[PDB]
């Protein structure tokens, strides 16, 4: 995408990065004028603007400026200040543009004679580089190819000075020939360097002091700016000169960027009648025309774009602005808007229609009000469900709304909308059905669809033999042929692929736009590689150009970049052309025809097999060659190389504004090389080099001999004339139908639609992991942070999903940090740290630390808080308690210290206590244990209430005490096990404590002493 | 019901070549349950099929059966065991 920047930053980066002998002046000498700024400060930051001439001319990308008179040459501060006064800031024109005059550029002017003057030009082109070359001064450089010096640079070719001297200055003066030739080397090294495309100096001041540069215009790769981040700074792409931005206009563009969708707008009459609201940029190109074709040039308010698959809130946001925008004025003959669009690849258009439906059924009223029409045409995957939801609203909401789909014209509604119509080596075979392939990345939808259409082809083998992905280890990926599961091998490095895979000709890049290139350098280094689809697009027009020039020095056809891919019907498919097996079957691509089409955009190759399929007999084979203005496969290429297939009957060429690519197409018909019938037509009209438009284009093409059709609508009917006349010939015979091998639905599509039940088995009520946040209970986890709720709070909503108070998490915490550790010398412990010693990970020690708390380590909470729960709740008092507990033959659990009896308390059963008697509201199990164990220190002075006995009879005390609970799942959580957790999960600190402990100790692997074993093993079994 | 009329597909993951649960009876690698006890092949035999998916030769899964029995055991205080008998201890 060559963009033009504005001369300020180019001339700014011209001086930074030159390379010459020679001293290059005015260095970091200009300035920037614009309304907002102020004329204090640029004086003050800059004091060389009192010390030369100055020049002043407009900094908005205005060709011809001396022309018209819009350049203040030779005056001073205050006489540009005064000429300044009547320009800044308002309405000015050149040529058809008109717009307001923002900046000014201002430089030193330099007092320079006519002949010290010189014009270069240099540009990037297909085969090279071109190089213009003028000495003689002033606009007057004559004609640019005789007496101004060009020359032809090539791609990843150096250029020679000695070159320099010996043909772009026979004509120079010999005063200035080394210093002007090291001037042109340096632009030259500059210019590859740094990647433009586009680069004028038509005045170029080189006195005997050094080289001036004055005015210059420059275009740039913008593509390439994953290159130049560091080289370019803050890279400034200024708009074309016109008019400024509606509000609705701004809201499109920067919604526009924020996604991975193409959303564009651009109006043309905003009170016109004729709307778009169109999928698809070939689409929306052919609608323009046909509507400027069709009368309506007047009258048509804007082109639309909505492409990639946008989001609902974009295409709600998108439509509410769109049609919040005709209800503004109204119109005596009422206001059309046309939902038009190609056929969709695999995007659903039901959930597109749905975000149209609630865009509409918000804004009803006003449109009823206008008396609005709606014409609706897409296709695809599922659009019998949005032609069906478009009816339904239409028929609730009053608005008439007139749908088809792909069995009608995909432009004819437009014929419709004004009223015209009543409304109802390179081989010359690329691939065969002995075609494999081998695809560069992670793309299994591509390969599946690949299979897919294999299958359907009655293809008895699979087309792709391999993948390639250097991120991940050699393995296998499980895809469909048919019904059967077959296995294709994923290889890490493309040697390994390539020497298991020897019948390998096709590979299909799948690559980034920016490692496209050195995968693509690898590839063509095998041999048995004959073409390569580089599907990418975003890829420089430098490296490009480098894959063109070794396509053409090994033979190696390059299909694309920015291409879709190409599809021949009963041998092969590349990538994602033609979609799904939807618009396969609707464009019965299962078999071949006689047809075969060329096309540029991917997006048209949908409708141009529709057209086919429907008027004439069905595609041989279409190659979409891409959008990129550097094509590796040109038009030409593929029409000698179907003119050369003895199997098709006629060539369809859709190309489109600018290039002379097909320029060859008409001279290789006036030569007589191409004898097949071909249907040419050029979009992108656009009239709202003058050979590069496409109406002159088009009776170019028509007297040179091409069955053109007037417009789009008659491009179908064309074709089907030319069929009807050439099957009249006795040349083309139509082959018995036979019907296709079906494949079954996909499960996952089949349940986007809602046509199947599967029975969903592992119900869960803890955790949402899709949506847009995470939620626990039902809140989600931005407002766990904001109420500032602790580890006591994510427990209490995963564990028990109910916000607990906050002395109820803070008592959670609390027990939790007493129950982290109690020392090595326990079981789990010991567990852990003989795991960990035995040179185990933490995983498998921590874990083999908490297997071993069961009933006898670690079972006191949950026991003794069932204990205590069986007590309370059969009205037991704690005196027959302790006696029946004493009678029955086992201890209370939970209450008995070993050393700590009376007046030396537990200190960490006091805080706990402690807190639960001023924190929690009521206390009638606590005081049910402390009464036990008023009995039992009467007893025995070191029979108190343990920590794992007060945690369990305090835990049950806050569930069925604390809010929240309804006295059954306050004694159910007891029952499934809650007490145990809380136990592990505290217990769990401790232990990998331990792990980390006893690993950066550095100990080596325990064995225990014989001596503390004593084996008792019998004497002889 | 869609699946049995076959108009559907679903990836199916999970893949395996160790065990066939289904049909008549239980298949180890290629070979049936009875064709496993009618050969008199020992516990070497079903670690061939299972593990390796192969047949091994009569010395070869005896040879697995003896190198099983050596590695049985050797005493308590070993790390493992130590870490058996202190998890059995308490009561698990
Ligand atoms: C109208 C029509 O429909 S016609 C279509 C015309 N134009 C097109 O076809 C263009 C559309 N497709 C493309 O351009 C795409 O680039 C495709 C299809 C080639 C796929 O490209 P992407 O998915 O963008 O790139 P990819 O998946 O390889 O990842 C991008 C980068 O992420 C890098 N990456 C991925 N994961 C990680 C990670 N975890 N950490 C760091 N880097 C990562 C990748 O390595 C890659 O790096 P690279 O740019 O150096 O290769
Ligand atoms: O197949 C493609 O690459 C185009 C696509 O998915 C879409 O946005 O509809
Ligand atoms: O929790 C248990 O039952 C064991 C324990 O930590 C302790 O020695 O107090």
Same mark, same amino acid.
């Given at each position: ?126 085969? #090279? ?56 080397? @340096? ?167 749905? &975000? ?213 019907? &009963? ?83 859709? @190309? ?59 491009? &179908? ?12 010939? #006795? ?64 427990? &209490? ?91 029955? @033959? ?58 794992? #006995? ?72």
């Amino acid at each position: 995408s060559a963009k033009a920047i504005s001369e300020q930053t180019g001339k700014e980066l011209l001086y930074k990065f030159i390379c010459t002998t020679s001293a290059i002046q005015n260095r970091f000498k200009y300035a920037r004028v614009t309304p907002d700024t102020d004329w204090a400060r640029l004086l003050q930051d800059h004091p060389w603007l009192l010390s030369q001439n100055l020049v002043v001319k407009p900094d908005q990308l205005i060709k011809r400026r001396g022309k018209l008179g819009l350049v203040g040459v030779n005056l001073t501060l205050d006489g540009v200040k005064s000429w300044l006064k009547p320009r800044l800031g308002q309405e000015a024109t050149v040529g058809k543009a008109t717009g307001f005059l923002k900046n000014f550029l201002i430089e030193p002017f330099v007092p320079h004679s006519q002949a010290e003057e010189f014009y270069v030009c240099i540009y990037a082109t297909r085969e #090279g580089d071109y190089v213009l070359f003028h000495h003689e001064g002033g606009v007057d450089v004559g004609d640019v190819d005789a007496k101004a010096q060009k020359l032809l640079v090539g791609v990843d070719e150096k250029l020679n000075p000695e070159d320099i001297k010996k043909h772009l200055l026979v004509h120079a003066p010999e005063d200035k020939k080394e210093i002007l030739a090291s001037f042109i080397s @340096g632009l030259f090294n500059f210019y590859e360097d740094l990647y433009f495309t586009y680069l004028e100096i038509n005045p170029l001041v080189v006195t005997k002091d050094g080289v001036y540069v004055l005015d210059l215009a420059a275009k740039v790769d913008a593509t390439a700016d994953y290159i130049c981040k560091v080289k370019w700074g803050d890279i400034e792409f200024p708009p074309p000169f016109g008019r400024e931005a509606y509000p609705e206009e701004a809201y499109i563009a920067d919604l526009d960027a924020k996604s991975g969708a193409s959303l564009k707008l651009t109006l043309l009459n905003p009170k016109g009648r004729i709307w778009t609201m169109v999928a698809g940029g070939g689409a929306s190109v052919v609608y323009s025309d046909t509507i400027c074709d069709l009368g309506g040039v007047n009258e048509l308010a804007n082109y639309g774009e909505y492409s990639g698959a946008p989001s609902e809130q974009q295409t709600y946001d998108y439509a509410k602005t769109i049609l919040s925008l005709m209800t503004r004025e109204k119109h005596p003959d009422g206001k059309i808007l046309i939902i038009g669009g190609s056929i969709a690849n695999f995007t659903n258009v039901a959930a597109t229609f749905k &975000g149209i439906v609630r865009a509409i059924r918000d804004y009803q009223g006003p449109l009823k009000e206008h008396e609005v029409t709606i014409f609706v045409r897409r296709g695809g995957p599922n659009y019998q469900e949005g032609l069906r939801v478009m009816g339904e609203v239409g028929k609730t909401t009053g608005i008439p709304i007139h749908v088809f789909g792909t069995e009608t014209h995909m432009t004819a509604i437009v014929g419709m909308a004004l009223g015209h119509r009543p409304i109802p080596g390179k081989s010359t075979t690329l691939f065969s059905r002995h075609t494999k392939a081998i695809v560069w990345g992670m793309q299994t939808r591509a390969v599946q669809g690949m299979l897919d259409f294999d299958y359907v082809c009655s293809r008895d083998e699979p087309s792709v033999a391999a993948m390639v992905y250097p991120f991940t280890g050699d393995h296998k990926q499980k895809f469909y042929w048919g019904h059967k599961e077959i296995l294709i091998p994923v290889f890490k490095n493309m040697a390994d692929a390539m020497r298991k895979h020897p019948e390998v000709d096709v590979l299909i890049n799948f690559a980034s736009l920016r490692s496209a290139y050195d995968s693509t350098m690898e590839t063509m280094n095998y041999a048995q590689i004959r073409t390569i689809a580089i599907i990418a697009e975003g890829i420089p027009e430098a490296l490009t150009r480098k894959l063109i020039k070794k396509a053409d020095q090994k033979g190696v056809t390059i299909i694309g970049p920015a291409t879709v891919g190409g599809i021949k019907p &009963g041998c092969f498919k590349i990538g994602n052309t033609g979609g799904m097996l939807d618009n396969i079957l609707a464009s019965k691509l299962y078999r071949p025809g006689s047809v075969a089409y060329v096309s540029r955009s991917g997006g048209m190759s949908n409708e141009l097999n529709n057209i086919i399929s429907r008027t004439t007999d069905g595609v041989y084979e279409g190659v979409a060659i891409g959008g990129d203005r550097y094509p590796g496969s040109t038009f030409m290429d593929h029409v000698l190389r179907y003119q050369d297939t003895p199997g098709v009957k006629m060539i369809v060429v859709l @190309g489109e504004i600018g290039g002379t690519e097909e320029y060859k197409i008409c001279r290789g018909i006036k030569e007589g090389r191409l004898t097949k019938p071909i249907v040419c037509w050029c979009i992108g009209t656009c009239a709202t080099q003058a050979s590069e438009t496409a109406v002159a284009k088009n009776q170019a093409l028509k007297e040179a001999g091409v069955f053109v059709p007037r417009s789009f609508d008659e491009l &179908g009917e064309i074709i089907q004339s030319v069929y009807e006349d050439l099957v009249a010939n #006795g040349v083309i015979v139509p082959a018995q139908e036979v019907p296709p091998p079906t494949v079954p639905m996909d499960y996952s599509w089949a349940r986007e639609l809602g046509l199947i039940r599967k029975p969903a088995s592992f119900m869960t009520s803890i955790c949402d992991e899709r949506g847009q946040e995470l939620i626990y209970a039902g809140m989600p986890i931005t407002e766990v942070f904001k109420e500032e709720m602790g580890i006591g709070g994510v427990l &209490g909503l995963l564990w028990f999903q109910k916000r607990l108070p906050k002395y109820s998490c803070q008592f959670i915490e609390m027990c939790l940090m007493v129950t982290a550790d109690h020392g090595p010398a326990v079981s789990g412990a010991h567990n852990t740290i003989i795991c960990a010693r035995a040179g185990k990970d933490l995983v498998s020690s921590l874990t083999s630390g908490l297997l071993t708390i069961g009933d006898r380590f670690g079972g006191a909470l949950d026991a003794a808080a069932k204990m205590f729960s069986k007590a309370f709740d059969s009205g037991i008092i704690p005196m027959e308690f302790v006696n029946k507990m004493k009678k029955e @033959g086992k201890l209370i659990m939970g209450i008995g210290h070993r050393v700590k009896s009376i007046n030396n308390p537990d200190m960490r059963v006091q805080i706990l206590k402690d807190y639960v008697r001023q924190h929690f509201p009521a206390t009638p199990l606590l005081d049910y244990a402390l009464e036990v164990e008023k009995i039992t220190t009467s007893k025995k002075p070191n029979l108190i209430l343990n920590v794992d #006995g007060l945690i369990g009879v305090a835990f049950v005390d806050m569930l069925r005490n604390c809010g929240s609970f309804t006295r059954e799942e306050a004694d159910e959580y007891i029952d499934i096990g809650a007490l145990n957790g809380i136990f592990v999960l505290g217990r769990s600190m401790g232990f990998i404590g331990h792990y980390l402990d006893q690993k950066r100790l550095k100990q080596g692997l325990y064995r225990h002493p014989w001596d503390d074993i004593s084996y008792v093993l019998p004497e002889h079994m």
